[PDB]
């Protein structure tokens, strides 16, 4: 389809991950995997070969930068802060790709890449958990963007409702062939 | 023109007082919500600003004499702001009294008691109370009880005696007879007609009330004693006082923990619904929103949005440290919050209502002038919260609410178990509070000589409460200061009055709601008429005599145990059948007197030599056998004595404490060793 944006200089964070929906295209997965190397292909209810054969109504790809060592934190069944307050995966539609992208392909690595570690709210200390296929709320992100990188829990007031949020970076865990995560769902 | 300038002064005070109260109360809230040195500093600074404000205003307040004030609310507000308190003390005495107060608090707080036989195991106060509430070992319970008295009591003694004098001098500087009146003055008020109450009949009301609830306490005493005798065999006599260390706590203020040894119908389950609440998927918010539903169906106030947004209803898992002790907060500017760590339990279900009820009262008097924004008195605040708690504790509520099975029915065995547990909580503590303040008042007044403080403490305690010391004590001890409230200068009588008011309020409200049958089965849910009467009284705050507030809801200006006795009527009758003629107790007996010997007559050094000779005689008696016991003069215990006339004694093993060697054994131990008891 048009995958010139998937492999572009801006590499999105977990707190603010990016995605696209591709329609009315002839897919070319065999090039995507030739342009960048893949270390792991982990997918339920579908196979690496199945995704390369046949046309589908809609293709959705979500992506963000993320260190390999933390791969278990995106696992199904995980109760980690990374998956709970930022990126919940959609398991209602059949693939997590761990792919190192060579510095020869203009992808940069700049900015304090981060994810939300906590986002409570109200007198219930109720948590603000991200629904599968969704994104962290504007209120959680706005607070987190003004937090220290040391993970302190700070109070904010958003529209009359109190929130206690914290943010933690992983800006240090980078390599020239930076490790990125892509998630593919096929309709 | 005094009336007019006093008016302007108070209006000015009240305006800034509310603004500053908000800053201080909020800083304190934020600190407890989120614990850190930074917030502790903000809290301390905000509190310092408050004190400077209040103190400066109390200086100007002296320019507005009460003599020329005809308005009741100006009169009351000036009386509150004008008091000097500790400030009429000179700098030396003020500083010394503060130092003594702080030292007394510290000795109590970090007091420790170690195991006398195995002194590598030692407990802090909270560790000691855990042992004291749970153990059934007569020996362990005794060294915990006795240890605390010698480790903490005796260290507090030298401070209390100076303390009493300085507190009395402070009170005299405020135009009181002594410190007793300083405290009793919290109930004093002068209204119109019969709404005029003297601080000097508080003593009259508590003595009268105490006597009317004596029959109920005597029935409870005989029952608990008869049952407790099977937990601690041949330690407790058929008739007499209970040993202090077997009462289920460090001070014996509640018989709450004796319930498990005293259950009327032990095989029967009590009522709660913790398992049901989990099955029905309850949580914090549900628990509090259900409590609001209750207050609304009674006809009082609904909660504000700030409460639901601003409070702490659950324990956080964010990484923040907090203190979970339940407290209702009023931060000013009509900002009402609850700070509690709620979980799906019967205890939190009912506590949530208690804290909610305090807020309902806080709202009602919000309309009052700043200094008058409190309840009618010390007792009304909790008395109201307790009534509103009883209303939902009852299974009548729990069933109507849909939490209990609709096939749920109330047995006449379950009724007895419930009432006894309540009696151990209420009936059992009433005599403790009464006796403590009875003694305390006499000490500050000056009716008990310093040298007779402990003598009267234990004599009076056996007469009123029916508790006796496992071991005799000298005047080096001061067991009264063993309790937090004495050591830290708190009034205790509020615990007596809140109970009496609680039942006066409950009964009047039930009658208004047209309740028929026993009061312990009363409910005020879906009774707007009972709701309206309660609201009118709560709204008064301190603008009227507390006897006025009492008259509106209970139709009298005096306190009566009348309603308490009716609450427990079915228990009284049940206990009577169980106790027969074992009703009441004697104050002649003590745990160590049965085996004592009497000595007829004397210097303290001669008493030492006597005790040394007795210890020697015991050593010789045992030496003849093949058991060696290292008895010393210290192991001979001396009972109440009459100087230069007579004394009594007994001896115990240095490695057990709880044991007393039988009179006959001690007596011929002395006879065998009759020779070689001479000197020079
Ligand atoms: C538990 O308790 C602690 C201690 O009180 C709280 O810590 C404070 O949290 C607040 C936020 O609620 C912080 O306020 C913010 O400070 C930012 C600047 O930080 C630097 O400078 C300060 C000194 O002033 C240093 O202490 C700090 O380390 C940094 O070097 C501001 O940029 C923020 O501005 C935002 O609000 C203003 C409002 O006027 C807007 O105009 C701005 O555009 C922006 O939105 C803000 O002022 C405060 O600095 C923290 N204190 C300390 C010592 O660090 C915890 O937050 C609290 N936690 C919870 C859950 O209650
Ligand atoms: C938490 O509070 C919000 C709003 O707070 C109020 O409005 C703010 C602007 C500020 O002035 C606060 O001090 C006020 O207390 C509540 O949201 C409202 O909910 C009602 C429904 O009950 C709705 O009709 C209003 O339009 C909402 N207002 C806004 C601004 O959104 C929210 O319900 C409160 N949370 C809870 C559990 O009650
Ligand atoms: C608080 O203490 C002050 C003294 O510091 C009391 O004021 C004195 O009262 C007496 C008796 O009326 C007067 O003779 C003095 O001249 C007053 N001194 C001053 C500086 O005003 C004040 O009455 C006390 N207030 C209360 C409520 O007890
Ligand atoms: C009174 O008896 C009850 C049992 O009916 C005790 O409750 C137990 O307390 C322990 C903690 O010490 C828990 O581990 C048990 O699970 C509780 N049992 C049940 C059935 O819940 C209660 O502690 C006793 N109270 C006193 C003062 O001894
Ligand atoms: C990345 O560069 C290395 C040389 O350092 C090369 O061997 C590797 O094949 C390149 N990866 C891709 C996907 O082209
Ligand atoms: C007393 O003062 C208050 C104002 O604080 C006023 O509302 C009330 O009517 C006054 N009562 C009398 C009898 O003057
Ligand atoms: C009060 O009345 C309501 C009906 O409006 C009912 O649902 C509720 O259970 C009643 N409360 C009690 C304690 O019976
Ligand atoms: C309960 O009622 C039964 C009669 O149905 C009676 O025999 C029993 O003694 C009563 N028990 C109590 C504690 O009142
Ligand atoms: C104290 O003596 C009793 C016998 O009355 C015995 O059961 C208990 O174990 C002894 N305790 C110690 C510490 O010797």
From TrEMBL, chain A:
Glycosylation sites: 102
Post-translation changes: The cytoplasmic Cys-rich domain is palmitoylated. Spike glycoprotein is digested within host endosomes.
Localization per record: Virion membrane; Host endoplasmic reticulum-Golgi intermediate compartment membrane; Host cell membrane
UniProt domain BetaCoV S1-CTD: residue ranges: 1-187
Disulfide bonds: 1-25, 43-95, 119-140
Biological role stated in the UniProt entry: Spike protein S1: attaches the virion to the cell membrane by interacting with host receptor, initiating the infection.
Notes concerning its domains: Fusion peptide 1 (FP1) and fusion peptide 2 (FP2) function cooperatively and have a membrane-ordering effect on lipid headgroups and shallow hydrophobic regions of target bilayers. They are considered as two domains of an extended, bipartite FP. The membrane-ordering activity is calcium-dependent and also dependent on correct folding, which is maintained by an internal disulfide bond in FP2.
Annotated family: Belongs to the betacoronaviruses spike protein family.
Subunit architecture: Homotrimer; each monomer consists of a S1 and a S2 subunit. The resulting peplomers protrude from the virus surface as spikes.
Protein name: Spike glycoprotein
UniProtKB/TrEMBL annotation, chain B:
Binding locations of chloride: 187, 494
Binding-site residues, Zn(2+) 1: 354, 358, 382
Binding site for Zn(2+) 2: 354, 358, 382
Record bears the keyword Isomerase: no
Keywords attached to this entry: Carboxypeptidase, Cell membrane, Cell projection, Chloride, Cytoplasm, Disulfide bond, Glycoprotein, Hydrolase, Membrane, Metal-binding, Metalloprotease, Phosphoprotein, Protease, Secreted, Signal, Transmembrane, Transmembrane helix, Zinc
Coiled coil (residue ranges): none
SUPFAM superfamilies referenced in this protein's UniProt entry, alphabetically: Metalloproteases ('zincins'), catalytic domain
Disulfide bridge positions per record: 114-122, 324-341, 510-522
Subcellular localization, as worded in the UniProt entry: Apical cell membrane; Cell membrane; Cell projection, Cilium; Cytoplasm
Family: Belongs to the peptidase M2 family.
Name of this protein: Angiotensin-converting enzyme
Organism this protein belongs to: Pipistrellus kuhlii (Kuhl's pipistrelle)
